Amino acid sequence: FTPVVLATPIPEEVQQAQTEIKLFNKWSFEEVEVKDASLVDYVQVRQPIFVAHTAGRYANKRFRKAQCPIIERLTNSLMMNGRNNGKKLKAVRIIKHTLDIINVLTDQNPIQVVVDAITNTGPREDTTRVGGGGAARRQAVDVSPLRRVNQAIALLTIGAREAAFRNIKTIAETLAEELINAAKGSSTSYAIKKKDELERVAKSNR
Amino acid sequence: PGVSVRDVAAQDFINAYASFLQRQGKLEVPGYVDIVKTSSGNEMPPQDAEGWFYKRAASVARHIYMRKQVGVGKLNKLYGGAKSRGVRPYKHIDASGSINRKVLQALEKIGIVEISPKGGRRISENGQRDLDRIAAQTLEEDE
Amino acid sequence: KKKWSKKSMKDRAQHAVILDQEKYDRILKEVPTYRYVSVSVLVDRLKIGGSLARIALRHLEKEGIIKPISKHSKQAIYTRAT
Amino acid sequence: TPVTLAKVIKVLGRTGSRGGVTQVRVEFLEDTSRTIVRNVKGPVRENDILVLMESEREARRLR
Amino acid sequence: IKIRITLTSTKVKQLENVSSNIVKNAEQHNLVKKGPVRLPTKVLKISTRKTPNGEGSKTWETYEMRIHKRYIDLEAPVQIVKRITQITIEPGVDVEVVVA
Amino acid sequence: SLVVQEQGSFQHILRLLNTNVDGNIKIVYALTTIKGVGRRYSNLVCKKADVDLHKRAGELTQEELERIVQIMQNPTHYKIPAWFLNRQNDITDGKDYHTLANNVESKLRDDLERLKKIRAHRGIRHFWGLRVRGQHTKTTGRRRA
Amino acid sequence: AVPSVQTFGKKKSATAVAHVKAGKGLIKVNGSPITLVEPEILRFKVYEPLLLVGLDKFSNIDIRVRVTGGGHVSQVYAIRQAIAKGLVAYHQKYVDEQSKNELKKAFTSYDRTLLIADSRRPEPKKFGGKGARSRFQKSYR
RNA sequence: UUAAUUGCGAUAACGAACGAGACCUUAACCUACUAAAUAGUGGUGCUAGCAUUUGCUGGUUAUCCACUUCUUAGAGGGACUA
RNA sequence: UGACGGAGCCAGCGAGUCUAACCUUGGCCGAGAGGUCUUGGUAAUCUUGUGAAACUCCGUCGUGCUGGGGAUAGAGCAUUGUAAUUAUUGCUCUUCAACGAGGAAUUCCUAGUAAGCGCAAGUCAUCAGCUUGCGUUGAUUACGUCCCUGCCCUUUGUACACAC
Secondary structure: OOOOOOOOOOOHHHHHOOOOOOHHHOOOOOOOOOOOOOOOOOOEOOOOOOOOOOOOOOOOOOOOOOOOEHHHHHHHHOOOOOOOOOOHHHHHHHHHHHHHHHHHOOOOOHHHHHHHHHHHOOOOEEEEEOOOOOOOOEEEEEOOHHHHHHHHHHHHHHHHHHHOOOOOOOHHHHHHHHHHHHHOOOOOOHHHHHHHHHHHHHHHOO | OOOOHHHOOHHHHHHHHHHHHHOOOOOOOOOOOOOOOOEOOOOOOOOOOOOOHHHHHHHHHHHHHHOOOOOHHHHHHHHOEEEOOOOOOOEEEOEOHHHHHHHHHHHHHHOOEEEOOOOOEEEOHHHHHHHHHHHHHHHHHHO | OOOOOOOOOOOOOOOOOOOOOOOHHHHHHHHHHOOEEOHHHHHHOOOOOHHHHHHHHHHHHHHOOOOEEEEEOOEEEEEOOO | OOOEEEEEEEEEEEEOOOOOEEEEEEEEOOOOOOEEEEEEOOOOOOOOEEEEOOOOOOOOOOO | OOOEEEEEEOOHHHHHHHHHHHHHHHHOOOOOOEEEEEOOOEEEEEOOEOOOOOOOOOOEOOEEEEEEEEEEEOOOOOOOOOOOOOOOOOOOOEEEEEOO | OOOOOOOOOOOOEEEOOOOEEEOOOEHHHHHHHOOOOOHHHHHHHHHHHOOOOOOEOOOOOHHHHHHHHHHHHOOHHHOOOOOOOOEOOOOOOOOOEOOOHHHHHHHHHHHHHHHHHOOOHHHHHHHHOOOOOOOOOOOOOOOOO | OOOEEOOOOOOOOOEEEEEEEEOOOOEEEOOEEOOOOOOOOOHHHHOHHHHOOOOHHHOOEEEEEEEEOOOHHHHHHHHHHHHHHHHHHHHOOOOOHHHHHHHHHHHHHHOHHHOOOOOOOOOOOOOOOOOOOOOOOOOOO
8 A cells, every 4th residue: 555654644544545536535426326327316425425415506506506515415315304404414413323324223334325315215107296287287208317316315415304303313224224115115214205196196187 | 743723623621621730620619610601691590510620621722722801791792692572582691701701710719811912811731731731632532 | 261282192101210230231332333323312212311412422432433534513423433 | 227218309398287397208228319308307408328227117297 | 304294185187286286396306205005096975865845755866975085295495395395285175294 | 342231120210309200311410300490400419429321210229319308408418519509698597598399389488479469560560471571572472381 | 945835626616735845744723623523423524635636645735724714614615625725735736737637637537626716606686585596485365 | 678768670761869878986917117114014133931953933123134926005006898 | 504602703984072971992800781991092093903793613402382482571680860660671491372474455675786784973971773884705687668557759539737
């Protein structure tokens, strides 16, 4: 290895971080592929990052939000519920803590678990307003791949946030349990159940 | 080498200097240690009970090392914080002046901080050497 | 007046506040089977109150089995060290 | 879940009473040369593979 | 003798040429000196309601005024405080001669 | 490891100063149930009694509760600041007092009755049921009758 | 006359100047080693310019950075930008382009913010609301 | 077509005026100019602590020297969608 | 994604006394409010690096109308003023009520913006939960429509002209 020690020494673990790209210091971005070809080119996993805290220029135009790391999007969507506005230093702390539980329990790469979960909880069909003129009326339409990822992330965040409301379990394990259960496609997930509701509603009003 | 108080993390150094202040309590112990609230903004006395005076002394001395001159009001402003004024919104409130005064005078008695020109206090010549010797210790404790 | 909201918690199953013996044998033989262990895990499955997991989580970390994968602010993540 | 992978080649325009849906001319990757028009709720520009749960329903302007 | 020429005004152009004339009189003869020091502008701001009465949508105002301050540092004996004291004063800007 | 067992001395409930003191909680906060004792005063009483603050109310030896109890009924004798009492410079005598569970409520009625009998503004408004500290009542304090 | 260069950097309102002279590999901020940040999470964010290309180019330089202004993350973003521009400046007064041009290409290939400062700045507050776009709550009846 | 009767152009209309635009201020850029202990930076002396092996962290206006990258400005440049 | 107790602990706008008594540094006394003897400043110079808060790291706690939350009151200690009583305000102890995410309906918002956070100034002898500005942390969601609420031009109809 490269044992270079400067005048100000750095721990060997940080020196190890220079071999591969950032890697969240413990978790491979590579060997992580989105199973669905529909969500390819919209779930950014190729570009690696040390941390999920960047001041990107993502909201100026339409589609630079697609060119954003998926892990960073999870931290942004975990920053909601009113009083928890800002405090991005916190948001990455649960993400780091939750991401660890995905490694201690269900021992695969947690980044892989994240990407397959969002591809398995993104609605494929949805209903829309068409009331036109006459009280109400629904009508089913399709969902774009970008909206599939956005809806998938939103459902996972709100489900763990609600399940952590007035409960001993912290948001770290609640996020971990929600993502793991959605990863394997189990019915106990709030996001999976919500996807069933939207798809069934669209199927009935087809 | 060339280690010093700036070559150390804050938490480890303050605890280490608190460790090398409790083992021999040479500095002082005020009579009202267990009844102060550290400020009019804080609602409860510190839960350290037995200590918390050499912990503040460790923090004050480390703060003195990186600076040149401070005052008791400066320590009050630094060690203060927001106060929950009931339904009214929070507001910055200075710390307890007597507590910082007793700490600052206590650091003078041992010989770690003394008065300086242009007003205020300053780290002592014996104070600088022992505080730097602390840094040479806390790094090698983990080594 | 009217509230349009519910007012009930559940049924507080208050449990151990001081560690006893009949569950001291329980903990030493039951947590070493936890692939993931933390403060909340034995609060739910082992049914332990507030100021006993933190001591118990400090218990085995200093003594034996479970190991500090990631112990940090408000989250002590430990595995089934074997 | 029998789905059909279909990639758009042309976007007609956003439709609906509130502009929440869009008409797109989309062709299927498998069994190509067959082209249909479908509705999209989210943002779509081109080369987007939408998961079509059912591939047999002609789309039209919605009120 | 540490003559310092302090100039304050609200018009930048009129204050600039006064400093230019003072500095041009300085660089003539010998008069080793320090050039114009550019102090930050003091921007007064009084915010007031446009409505004289209380009726009307809340529409506030801001009447601002900028003060430009520059001082000229001279260093020479009495043979120039017979010469510098000839004030090159334009309307607006003012001068305050301060020694030591 | 700072783990200790229990033999049976734990009592799930206490009774100090003629009031219910529930156990299962830390001693510093289990004493807050007494009418007239708060978080700071209970912390002060426990600190001078040397009762090992990190101790549950049930897991307390009986020899320490009497020491706590005696401090409750006579704080000024045990080096307690004169400014750490609820009833300071009593209108009857002037000695610094400290009302207790039953004394806090009873003494409260006496001073209102003293205020009422003298026909002062605070006394009459207390009988009326309105505010006595000068708050506005036009839009506040409605659901009281 | 010992070899040295200087740079600057801002995030929102902070400033960070790196006097990168010729040394034995000392990276210090406000007299403290680089390993003592403060967010303890963006420590790898300030570790960035150290690790994109390698530590071999950092073995003959000492970067001393003084920072003033902004929040804790703003200070961190000031430090990373200053040292990244400090590295290129040392390569922009002594060393060849191949050292510099692939240094200065790779830095922006990962993120443009390492050299290019964030152009966005706070907008002035307008009357009628707590912020610029935000307005007070209006009501009828 | 444009944020805009803002333009292309059409045309019993031609030539115009006000508004808009243009303009002014502020926020961003300048390692290019003028500079500056009422803003700083580096260096030379005095002096302190750690290690002394080569250094690091500091304090110091009469210890002086040099500079304006950061700090402020004045005159200017840059942006026109190329 | 909490409260509490320790530590780290970083900003910008702006104001400040002459024949007055302002901003107050520093030392001393007091748990605190505050008091006391002085110092610097007509101001990039002194207050002030406004060492602000939200923030982060160690611990206390535990899912508990509880260590959440501080209305309601009782007693005491000081400041401002000729005067404070229907407490100006500040500080200490104690009392610890509604409130467990809010129904018909409705407000604001497309980037450093929303939101969270504090600061300065205005009113001022004293009193911010207000307003005007400043900076700190900093999301999701559109790149479209006239469906609802309104606007501009043209065509068309009118028994309207104080004009649906």
